[PDB]
From a paper:
Following the nomenclature introduced by Misura et al., Vps33 contains three domains: domain 1 (residues 1–138; red), domain 2 (residues 139–248 and 502–667; green), and domain 3 (residues 249–501; blue), with domain 3 further subdivided into 3a (residues 249–380) and 3b (residues 381–501). The C. thermophilum Vps33 and Vps16CTD–Vps33 structures provide a first detailed view of an SM protein from the Vps33 family and of its recruitment into a multisubunit tethering complex.
The structure of C. thermophilum Vps33 was determined using MAD phasing and refined to 2.6 Å resolution. The two copies of Vps33 present within each asymmetric unit of the crystal are highly similar to one another and can be superimposed with a root-mean-squared deviation of only 0.56 Å (over 580 Cα atoms). Despite this very high degree of overall similarity, a functionally important region of domain 3a adopts somewhat different conformations in the two Vps33 monomers. Within our Vps33-only crystals, the tip of domain 3a adopts two different open conformations dictated by direct, intermolecular tip-tip interactions within each asymmetric unit. The positioning of domain 1 in Vps33 is substantially different from that observed in all previously determined SM protein structures. For example, after domains 2 and 3 of the two independent copies of monomeric Vps33 are superimposed, the two copies of domain 1 differ by only a 2.2° rotation and a 0.6 Å translation. This analysis reveals that the binding site normally occupied by the N-peptide’s conserved Arg side chain is, uniquely in the case of Vps33, filled by Arg-115 of the SM protein itself. In this case a displacement of the Vps33 backbone, relative to other SM proteins, causes the side chain of Leu-129 to occupy the binding pocket.
Author numbering: 5 to 212, 223 to 276, 296 to 338, 344 to 546, 556 to 582, 600 to 654
Write the structure that this text describes.
Amino acid sequence: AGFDAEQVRDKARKDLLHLLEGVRGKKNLVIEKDLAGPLGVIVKASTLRDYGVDNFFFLENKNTGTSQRNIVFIARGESVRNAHAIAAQIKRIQRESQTSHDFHIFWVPRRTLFSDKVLEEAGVLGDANISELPLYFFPLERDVLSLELNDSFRDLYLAKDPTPVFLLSRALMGIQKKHGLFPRIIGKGENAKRVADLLSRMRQELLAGLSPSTTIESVIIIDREVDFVTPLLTQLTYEGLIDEYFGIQNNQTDVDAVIVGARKRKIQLDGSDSLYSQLRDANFAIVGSLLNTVARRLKSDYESRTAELKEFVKKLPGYQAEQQSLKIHSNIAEEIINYTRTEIFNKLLEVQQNLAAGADPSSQFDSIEELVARDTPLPQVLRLLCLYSCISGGIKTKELDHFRRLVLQGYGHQHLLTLHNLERLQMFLSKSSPLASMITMSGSSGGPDQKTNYTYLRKQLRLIVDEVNEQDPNDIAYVYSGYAPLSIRLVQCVLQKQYLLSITKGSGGGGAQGWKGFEEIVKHARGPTFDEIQKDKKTVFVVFVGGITFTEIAALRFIAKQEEARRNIVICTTSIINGNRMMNAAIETA
């Protein structure tokens, strides 16, 4: 009766395959490198072959073949870069003749004016048959939908491109068209508010036949800028650390070849593996113990004491898969264990946990300087400086100038750009800057965009949970060993008020809706608080504009398990983000 992630995949594959069915004959396929990964989430390469794909090409390789007269470009239309690349590629192909003279472009999801103009301005516009592929959300898991806009953090927060926000609201409207209006549109933050506004004005346009869902409870929209502190921190879940040290993209990562046990190899990382399903959301401290329990259960099943010989060989493939999974994750865990034992890592964690806990950030000054002396990697130092700034309402000017110098001398003068970019993103500011001040009620004002108050909210939303036990956690704070992501505490102000009241005020009636009971507190997080009513169990879509971490996902699944009876939780996002990705946005954007 309600939403299911599998229908998004089916529609996506159907939509793509139909367009491939419109290009009659076999065809060559040119794809934006970044789109290639997410496309694999909805269709298998073997399937594309069955629909006439002779060869596959990455647009950026600039080496499209001749073997087939049909050429198909698949790329994002919002990208200024792609419009040029495709035009260049058509002209370069046309003049290496007589090769392949039937061009198609599938723009994702929408044809833009800028793109149509570039093609015409290059002359090739009357040569390509242009379609539109309405792919928005890619379902990475049953409970995780992603726009897979890996540059959207930079695009939105640095470059001020509104496109990620527009695309997210269209994706969200799509769901309303199929399952009814979200009864409630709830959220925090300037960009999340704009998502609501665009959802509103889109509805208003349709009335020119759409009713509240019977199967959807609400949509909660968190704006990532409300809480930079969470991504800056080192993630301490299993998947979180795999992301921190190896990097996860399209449900995959690359690891040294010795790790897979027979350059580096690619490994799949999703819920189809029974073991990873149990490991990914666990605090890394209990992973060794989880592996041990699995290995033991495995040894026990093997030892659990004709034509059962042929039964054995049929079961042979399932035995390697389990074995291979256990072997690979044991090897990864041992790798991460090594990393987390170094003095640099222990020193890092210490400064992060102190700042997070609320120690005077000046008391961490000598530690930070020592981290620079030891040449710890640039992204890790920058993430500390940002945490410092973001958590304490800016850095003391005199310390800022010192840190600024250490960074430039230690890692290179080019990083003056990096720091200016961190300044534009408002994660590296002096206390003397008006933009740096956190929200208070004794705050006078100024402040069009006053910042989240972590000093106040640490207490009021109980960001620090000293007691949490990682072996059978009782609180989302487990994802950072004692620290609770603010973003998800905000989701809890809506979804688990009984519980949240229980651990902050007492006497946790508290099963009604909106931000009731938390409005004055949530006023101290950045941007607008909103709650808009539009006039089996139900799904709550929890949405992040500007990126979610694997730790927030783990914490959301934790809550999902507790809320199992009453709700289903579906996580939506413009992309999956982490601390390193944010620093890269600042480093690489000239």
